[PDB]
Amino acid sequence: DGVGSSSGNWHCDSTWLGDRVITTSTRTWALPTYNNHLYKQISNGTSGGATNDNTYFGYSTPWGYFDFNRFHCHFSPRDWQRLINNNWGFRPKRLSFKLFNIQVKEVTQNEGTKTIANNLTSTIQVFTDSEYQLPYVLGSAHQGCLPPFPADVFMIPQYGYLTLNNGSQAVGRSSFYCLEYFPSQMLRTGNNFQFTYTFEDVPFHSSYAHSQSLDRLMNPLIDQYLYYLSRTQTTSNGRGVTLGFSQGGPNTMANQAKNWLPGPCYRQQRVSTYPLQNNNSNFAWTAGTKYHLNGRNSLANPGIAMATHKDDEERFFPSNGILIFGKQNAARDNADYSDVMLTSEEEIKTTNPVATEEYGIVADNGQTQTTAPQIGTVNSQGALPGMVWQNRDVYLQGPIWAKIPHTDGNFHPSPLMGGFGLKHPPPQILIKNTPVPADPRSTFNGDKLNSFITQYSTGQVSVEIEWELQKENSKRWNPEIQYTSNYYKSTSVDFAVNTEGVYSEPRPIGTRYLTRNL
Amino acid sequence: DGVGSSSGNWHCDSTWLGDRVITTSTRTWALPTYNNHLYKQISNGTSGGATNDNTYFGYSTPWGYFDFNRFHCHFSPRDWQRLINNNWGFRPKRLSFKLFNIQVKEVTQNEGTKTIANNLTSTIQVFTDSEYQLPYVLGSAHQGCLPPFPADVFMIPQYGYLTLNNGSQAVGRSSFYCLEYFPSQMLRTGNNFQFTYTFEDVPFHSSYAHSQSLDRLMNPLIDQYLYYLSRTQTTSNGRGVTLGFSQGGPNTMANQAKNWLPGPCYRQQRVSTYPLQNNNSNFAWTAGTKYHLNGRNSLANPGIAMATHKDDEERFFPSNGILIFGKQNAARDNADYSDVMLTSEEEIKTTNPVATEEYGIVADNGQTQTTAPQIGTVNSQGALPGMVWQNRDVYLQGPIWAKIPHTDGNFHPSPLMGGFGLKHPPPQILIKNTPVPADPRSTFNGDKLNSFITQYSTGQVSVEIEWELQKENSKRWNPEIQYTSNYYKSTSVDFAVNTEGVYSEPRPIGTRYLTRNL
Amino acid sequence: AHSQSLDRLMNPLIDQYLYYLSRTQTTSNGRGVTLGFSQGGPNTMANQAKNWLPGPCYRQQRVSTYPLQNNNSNFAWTAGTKYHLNGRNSLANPGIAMATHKDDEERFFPSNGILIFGKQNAARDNADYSDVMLTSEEEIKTTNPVATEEYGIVADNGQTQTTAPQIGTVNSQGALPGMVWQNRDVYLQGPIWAKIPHTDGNFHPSP
């Protein structure tokens, strides 16, 4: 394997075998030099216009990293359709990673002309953090993924991390990390890199909706043998005290005894899609739903999984309580409503409470002959025995996994942006250009060398994931709901390039179409 | 195999062994970057000056493809002569393909000076579509073949395809294809590519003419024992009704009973080579012979195989009903009659009807004593039991095969431009330069990379086809007609270069010289 | 369904090496006779040479779903598309497989040329249009001709200097070499099999 032989081939394919499917993707990347080969302290503090909520302390490194953690990395729109229409669930099993056909290039400036040449003896260096010894920066939903469309070339993002801070300052427990203090592999243009990984057992993502609601599980034809208190007061003659009792039945179903409870609630503020129906004020931050950690307020975004709206409320959404994707060429700041794509969790109404409404009612007081009953409203409810709930849905544009924090305890460790929680997630992959010094002085100086040759590198990357499928077995007589493409004529095809060669994704696509009994 | 060793050799040869011949060709190619590495939506619609007949919707890719589908790719004029003079038929058997001695080159502009350098670490990528999963664009008689003359260097054509349209717009069933979504092989300058293919059983092309005509198959010396109706009216005395009957014989041969029928007819409009004999008007489109598909009119070019003209009519040809080749350096649009070469199907008069004339006559009405017989003219005739016909001839400049459309049914699936119809034709071969990014910015941006280094590639291509021959076995006493070269002196040699180094082909050469009994 | 149409199989980016007759008459100066020739290309695609032909045609009469657009008369039987067997006329129902309508014609259907299912509790005789369910074969436009339109145009005569060209319209077309076609679709309410008649010969024995 010299300079004249390729170290790998292009693999983009999908294979559907029985109970599993295997996806494989190849992309072309470009890796710049970051920071001028330097580590740098970064911070932000309230001395400037920053509020206390936004302060941080950390470091930016001279390293890049690979991110394949979105679904459109591994699935074409047609492959995603086969998955969601035919299956009740899926989970990842194992992956392979390859890095090959590396070429390092040097650029030099003379006056205004720029030239690029090959540097055949330069290296890049790569390693995986397989012992989870670095701050794990995947799972924060950052940009810099492998592109959804296989013909696009992408830039590799810069690695950095945060530590503890007090304001803009570091405390005694703050940690610093040098990535050169890790063994890594060095590659010239004829070398290549690969590794394999196995996922730990994780539950299947549930791709389906319930065809029953938690409060409707009864037989509509039969009475219950249990009684409830239907009457505290005599109707006949005057008004007087009595105890009446009735059995629950077809017309009283709201009164019947039940075995189960809806899932937990943390209430969100309601926002209409028609702006004229909203109050006139800027309440996005002040009315936002937050948590409070070490004197510092953080918006709970999206939060726990709750139904977006109830029946015929579709114009409302929770303020910070949903995932929002941008359309192609949308602005970074202050984008309009026509520029973004709002997801809906509406399928989970059958089980989870609605995000913008109360959980229920409890008794505020005890009552007497002289004191009337008082009722409270429950806007926040933690886990109660007998609750059942659904997780948030996953999307073709959305994240796949997250790393579960290493802690004494946790409760239902499913990521709140949606995905698979993992104690040992796929390891993060660090990549860097090796610095090449410019000619030094001819007399010894002990200071470090600050003058380098300008370089960048390009190459190929492949990733292959095996997925396990859960087949749908159902006696439903009538046809299902399916994801489909519009039949009518159009100026362009959805999920294709336009006249200018730009690939766009028209809408977000969820996973829940087939149904199952509750 | 490094940068200093060649990955293949030059093979151009022909070998005649018994019942088979093997041809092999080598050419030099050049592959540009197309579209700036982009896929692009293309369309045409009636909003502009385009009529509804010419509308389309589709995509152009950044890929090239190889086309060897003309006969002059595989045969020298002398080899074609050996074939057509000595054999009654031939068909293809198997082929081999090689791609070797690849070299990638980078071109950079500084002011007005241009320089070209080798880029030793760059790749090209190649694949064959062997599962027939792409729109099959061969068999449309496009330019971009391997040149007929082995010393010429050719440019590789750009790949593209069409989908369904309504006007300039796409409908719901329109498909988009990314060719990067196919596994492909990547080659640096020291690598090479090859594959083999086997043709499915196909009938021999018939290279011969019939020495008998379908209506002359009788013994000229003997009467038939069958009778026909020769007389409806009394000749003697006055005019009166009678039924006369006669046996068919040597002088009545037009009246004899026969077992067979001429092939099908779709009539063409007649055009004289002497312009003064044609009507004065532009009737090429308005008088053209067409079919009508989804509200959109398409000229039937050339159409079903019919004889070009009858005896002593040689000055006439069917309007859109023949193949027309251009001479060397002929114009693209509005070329003169001396610039083009008209083929003639005249050999099939013995069987197929003439293209510009009616099929026959049928009865229009039933007759009575008061009603005289009425006759209709048959200008279009589909398949009747007892028909026999010949296919259109093949030429040294013409196509070899076509892909048979995948459909519920078809009738006599022989391509109408002439050739071998194939359910699984030789697979199409896609080739592309791998994009090499220019130096990116030193701070991360998430947009795709639009800036590249300009490159192109060159190399060698070999193709080898084995052909099976059908030997001629004949008791004819007198000598045959043969294809020959003119004996008389000339300014240049036919099928050679001129003073300027330009190779030309003087005339089209068909396959049908030897004869056979009908 | 096919995602391509039989007349669009070409590469949109490239010219053909074959020529066609584009010009019978001189544009410049006066009107005079000449022979012009052009190569087929991206903008001329209707003129290009092709290898294949659409399937066979037996034309049907056209009926609009909006009754106000139909002629005023009872033409169902008299304008019906028939065959004639032993002196006895039989409506050809549904007939050979043809596309129900072309683009943006969806309001039209062939008279006896489609399958029609009734809704629940529909009348036996003289049911209304809201009582029945019309199928559509529209998916086969890419290959088969439309049921209510002509197959194509052929030459009626030979031409001379004194005689102008005449064109005929082809309303019925049998099998030609190079045709391809699709069968009629099957439905959840429809039949599964049929018995092929026992005969000396048949052509494409699909029910």
Author numbering:
A (entry chain M), B (entry chain A): 220 to 737
C (entry chain f): 428 to 634
The publication says:
Adeno-associated viruses (AAVs) are helper-dependent parvoviruses that have become a leading gene therapy vector, with Food and Drug Administration approvals in the United States and a growing list of clinical trials under way. The AAV capsid is composed of 60 monomers of viral proteins (VPs) 1, 2, and 3, in a 1:1:10 ratio. The VP3 region forms the capsid surface, with a number of features common across AAVs. These include a pore at the 5-fold axis of symmetry, essential for DNA packaging during assembly and externalization of VP1/2 N-terminal domains during trafficking; depressions at the 2-fold axis and surrounding the 5-fold pore; and protrusions at the 3-fold axis, often used to engage cell attachment factors, including glycans and the AAV receptor (AAVR).
Importantly, while the AAV880 variant remains largely dependent on AAVR, the AAV840 and its evolved variant AAVhum.8, which carries additional mutations to aid with NAb evasion, showed nearly complete independence from AAVR, implying a receptor switching event. Utilizing 275,883 individual particle images the AAVhum. capsid was reconstructed to 2.49 Å resolution. The AAVhum. density map displayed the characteristic morphological features of other AAVs, e.g., a channel at the 5-fold symmetry axes, trimeric protrusions that surround each 3-fold symmetry axis, a depression at each 2-fold symmetry axis and shows high similarity to the previously described AAV8 capsid. Compared to AAV8, the capsid structure of AAVhum. is highly conserved except for VR-IV that displays major structural variation with a Cα distance of up to 3.2 Å. This difference is caused by the evolved sequence in VR-IV, including a single amino acid deletion that results in a slightly shorter loop relative to AAV8. Notably, the newly evolved VR-IV residues comprise of a highly conserved putative integrin recognition motif NGR, also located endogenously on most AAV serotypes. The remaining amino acid substitutions in VR-V, VR-VIII, and the HI-loop compared to AAV8 are visible in the density map but do not lead to alternative surface loop conformations. Additional structural models highlighting the AAVR footprint, as well as the newly evolved and endogenous integrin binding motifs, were then analyzed. These surface and roadmap renditions of the 3-fold symmetry axis further corroborated that the VR-IV integrin motif lies adjacent to the AAVR footprint residues without overlap. Compared to control cells, at least 10-fold less virus was bound to ITGB1 KO cells, whereas only ca. 2- to 3-fold less virus was bound to AAVR KO cells, indicating that AAVhum. binding on Huh7 is highly dependent on ITGB1 but not AAVR. However, it is critical to note that the AAVR residues are not mutated in the precursor AAV840 variant, implying that the newly acquired VR-IV NGR motif alone is sufficient to enable the switch to ITGB1 from AAVR.
